[PDB]
Design a protein around this ligand. Structure first.
Ligand SMILES: [C]C1=C([C])[C]=C2C(=[C]1)N([C][C]([O])[C]([O])[C]([O])[C]OP([O])(=O)OP([O])(=O)O[C][C]1O[C](N3[C]=NC4=C3N=[C]N=C4[N])[C]([O])[C]1[O])C1=NC(=O)[N]C(=O)C1=N2C(=O)/[C]=[C]/C1=[C][C]=[C][C]=[C]1
Lengths: 666, 133
């Protein structure tokens, strides 16, 4: 869309309707007259538009009312109420703007934020900008969390996030105007190369892929139309559902052949019956002729009974001859309606072994996309977030994604090398206990009003617990941590003295040998200004590779690469790095996914803040003290940088409301 | 609405490949056998058929009797009458064969005949004796 409505859509909001969370705060308006609703909407859209048109400076209430129009710019409490709501939930003035009113003299409330992964950072900036006292505690010695970027000389490569998923209402859209990231598009062109080391024909490539997409939708039909969602008590995975469909395909392939040859026999067996009839006719025709010959040797003149005999046997014969001509007639028809059948047999196979194997790469890709074995993705929900996807084409950060957290981090109080070990939260406050990662006996205590927890799901899953909650997290929240899926995927970074791949290609795939190893180095990325290649280890393979030395790994790499590019167009790599995210203590994996038997509704559970019991019993019910953000908390944008960033905005909005009071709901 | 066309997925078929641990490769194998068990029986009957084709080798060519090109008539030579009476005894109501035997009489002059000489050829008797066989 475009104009004011451009902004509404570009901000993830319906241009012509009020959201649930708008109703929440403007219950007067939404329950009120259609007329007023439409003013509101415009006001909202317009303000957005202004912020959007220019997000390198703050957008004040004044500056808004300024550019507004009568009738709209008549009611200035509406304008204030709207510009405030917007400001508060980070729809406007989020990220990195230039202030206009430098930051109000003294602060208010104190919040401890665990972990300076993007979610963390974005929430911290928000809060600080809302005049609060904010400290973030980070276990690592750098910001960014799962946004690692490797740097050395002019080598630059993310082992972290890597792709921006296209600017169609992506908040990163703004971030990227505010920060100098160089965004290069991802040329969708991706050649495949079998174990042998030779391209896969344009012929095949397409047959397989297209079968792949066909297979996917197939599962969707199974799921929704046939209701194949439980199976002897376990939830059905996508993997299961795929195999079941493939089987059913092979079953049909045979099914057909069977009833095709079954047609041959039923025909070849009419030919059999006819021939018998035909032989036994030549049998009478033989012996009958004889008798006519015999009856002709009685020489005339003959009496009438003997004359009759001749004439009679003569007819009887030309009669029997009639039939046999008509039967060799029929015979001919059948004999051809029989190469008819031998000319077009149904297909030999469903998929060949070179097929099943390429198809297997298309699965690896899906495993790479969801960081998991398809045997673990929920069939019913694995793709629930599919609707909310941005428009436009995926990109990469040419100068390293890390430039973004670094950017956000600027201005903030961040304790690096500070591993939170215990969160205790009570009616009157919280205290957080961290240690120093370098000498771990050396101890820290932080007192605050609220804790925003941006710990990775992996971490929150750990047994036994790496962070301990006091009191324990309510069971409803812990079940949700169990049920959800935290996946895994790893990168390998290859650094050379010269380009030797197709420079106009961004990504080529390698086709593995077995189902079991579809993920092993299945795809490579030429992304960068230096000669760097980047290779993925996804699916089942990912977890296994983390148990194998870097050399061995880089081995299998060069191997695969020589195989494609010629056994000595491929030099030794100057510099190599190899992630192990399931290993890494401050992540324990890569990003969440919708495990079988979970739903989207679990992501919502993750976000629900915690409210301590009362202190002195029968005192009034407290404020909520413990809140959560981060990638695993945002139902509609899981497992992504923008998704995190946005969870951060979310919680910061929510906390500010709670502690600084919502002035704008009146 | 329906499976993306090409894919086959009956309700009934699904419950069948799920039933147990390897109903999967079971049912896929019944057909694997079931198939060769037909392909084989094609051979048998392709062979049985092939021998019968060799018997028929020769056609019926040495046995076919030249064209009786002769022309229809009206008179009833006493010969023609006797031929008739005997054709009746051997053919019943097959007016067609009876005409064929007397060569030069129409399938109708025949039916006619049946009613003129019916009288003095006891064609009643004649016919009831063809029936008795
Ligand atoms: C792993 C990964 C890779 C390798 C790649 C990628 C990814 C991943 N993705 C995802 C993202 O990255 C995520 O989501 C984010 O980043 C997250 O964030 P947050 O939530 O904020 O979290 P973090 O970061 O982790 O942070 C946290 C923090 O905390 C801390 N800690 C822990 N523990 C502790 C602490 N502190 C104190 N104490 C204690 N105890 C840590 O350390 C940290 O800092 C992505 N995304 C996007 O957007 N893009 C991209 O590209 C990506 N990547 C890739 O490649 C693929 C995937 C995808 C894409 C697209 C779509 C879908 C998917």
């Amino acid at each position: 869309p475009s104009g004011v409505e451009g902004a509404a859509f570009q901000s993830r909001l319906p241009h012509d309707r009020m959201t649930s969370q708008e109703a929440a705060c403007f219950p007067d308006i939404i329950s009120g007259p259609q007329q007023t609703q439409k003013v509101f909407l415009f006001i909202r859209n317009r303000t957005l538009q202004l912020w959007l048109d220019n997000p390198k400076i703050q957008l004040t209430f004044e500056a808004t009312l300024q550019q507004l129009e009568a009738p709209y710019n008549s009611d200035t409490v509406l304008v204030h109420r709207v510009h405030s709501y917007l400001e508060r939930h980070g729809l406007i003035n989020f990220g990195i703007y230039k202030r206009i009113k430098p930051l109000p003299t003294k602060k208010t409330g104190k919040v401890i934020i665990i972990g300076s992964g993007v979610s963390g950072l974005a929430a911290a900036r928000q809060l600080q900008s809302f005049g609060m006292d904010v400290t973030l505690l980070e276990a690592r010695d750098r910001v960014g969390g799962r946004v690692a970027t490797f740097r050395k000389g002019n080598y630059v490569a993310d082992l972290g996030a890597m792709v921006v998923t296209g600017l169609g209402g992506n908040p990163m859209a703004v971030v990227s105007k505010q920060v100098n990231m160089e965004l290069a598009k991802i040329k969708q062109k991706c050649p495949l190369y079998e174990a042998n080391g030779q391209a896969v024909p344009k012929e095949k490539d397409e047959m397989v892929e297209q079968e792949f997409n066909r297979l996917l939708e197939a599962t969707s039909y199974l799921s929704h139309q046939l209701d194949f969602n439980v199976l002897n008590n376990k939830p059905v995975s996508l993997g299961q559902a795929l195999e079941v469909v493939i089987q059913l395909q092979e079953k049909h392939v045979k099914d057909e052949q069977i009833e095709h040859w079954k047609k041959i026999v039923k025909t070849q067996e009419e030919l059999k019956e006819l021939l018998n009839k035909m032989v036994n006719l030549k049998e009478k025709i033989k012996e009958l002729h004889q008798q006519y010959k015999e009856a002709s040797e009685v020489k005339p003149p003959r009496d009438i009974t003997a004359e009759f005999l001749v004439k009679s046997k003569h007819r009887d014969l030309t009669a029997l001859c009639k039939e046999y001509d008509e039967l060799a007639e029929t015979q001919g028809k059948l004999e051809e309606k029989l190469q008819e059948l031998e000319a077009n047999p149904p297909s030999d196979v469903y998929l060949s072994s070179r097929d099943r194997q390429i198809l297997d790469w298309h699965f690896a890709n899906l495993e790479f996309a969801n960081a998991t074995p398809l045997s673990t993705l929920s069939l019913k929900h694995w793709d629930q977030d599919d609707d909310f996807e941005f428009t436009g084409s995926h990109l990469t950060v040419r100068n390293g994604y890390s430039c973004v957290p670094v950017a956000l981090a600027e201005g903030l109080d961040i304790k690096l090398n500070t591993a939170v070990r215990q969160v205790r939260y009570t009616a009157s406050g919280c205290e957080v206990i961290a240690v120093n990662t370098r000498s771990t006996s050396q101890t820290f205590i932080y007192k605050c009003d609220a804790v925003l927890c941006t710990l990775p799901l992996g971490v929150l899953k750990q047994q036994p617990p790496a962070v301990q909650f006091v009191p324990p997290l309510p069971e409803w929240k812990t079940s949700a941590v169990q049920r959800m899926g935290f996946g895994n995927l790893n990168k390998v970074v290859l650094c050379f003295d010269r380009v030797f791949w197709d420079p106009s290609v961004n990504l080529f795939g390698h086709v593995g040998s077995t189902t079991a190893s579809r993920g092993e180095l299945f795809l490579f990325w030429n992304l960068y200004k230096a000669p760097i290649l980047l290779a993925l280890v996804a699916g089942e393979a990912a977890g296994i590779m983390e148990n194998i030395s870097d050399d061995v790994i880089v081995g299998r790499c060069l191997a695969i690469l020589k195989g494609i590019f010629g056994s000595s167009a491929v030099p030794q790599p100057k510099e190599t790095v190899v992630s192990r995210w399931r290993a890494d203590p401050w992540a324990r994996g890569s990003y969440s996914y919708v495990a079988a038997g979970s739903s989207g509704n679990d992501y919502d559970l993750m976000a629900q803040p915690i409210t301590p019991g009362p202190s002195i019993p029968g005192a009034p019910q407290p404020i909520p003290r413990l809140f959560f953000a981060g990638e695993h908390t945002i139902r509609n944008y899981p497992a992504t940088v923008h998704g995190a960033l946005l969870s951060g905005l979310r919680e910061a909005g929510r906390i500010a409301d709670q502690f600084l009071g919502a002035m704008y709901t009146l | 609405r329906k499976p993306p066309k090409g894919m086959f997925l009956s309700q009934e078929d699904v419950e069948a490949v799920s039933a147990n641990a390897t109903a999967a490769t079971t049912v896929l194998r019944q057909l694997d056998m079931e198939l060769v068990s037909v392909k084989r029986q094609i051979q048998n009957i392709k062979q049985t058929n092939s021998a019968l084709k060799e018997k028929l080798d020769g056609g019926i060519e040495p046995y076919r009797l030249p064209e009786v090109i002769q022309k229809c008539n009206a008179r009833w030579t006493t010969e023609e009458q006797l031929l008739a009476v005997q054709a009746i005894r051997k053919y019943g109501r097959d007016f067609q064969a009876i005409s064929d035997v007397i060569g030069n009489k129409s399938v109708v002059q025949v039916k006619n005949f049946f009613v003129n000489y019916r009288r003095r050829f006891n064609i009643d008797e004649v016919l009831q004796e063809w029936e008795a066989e």
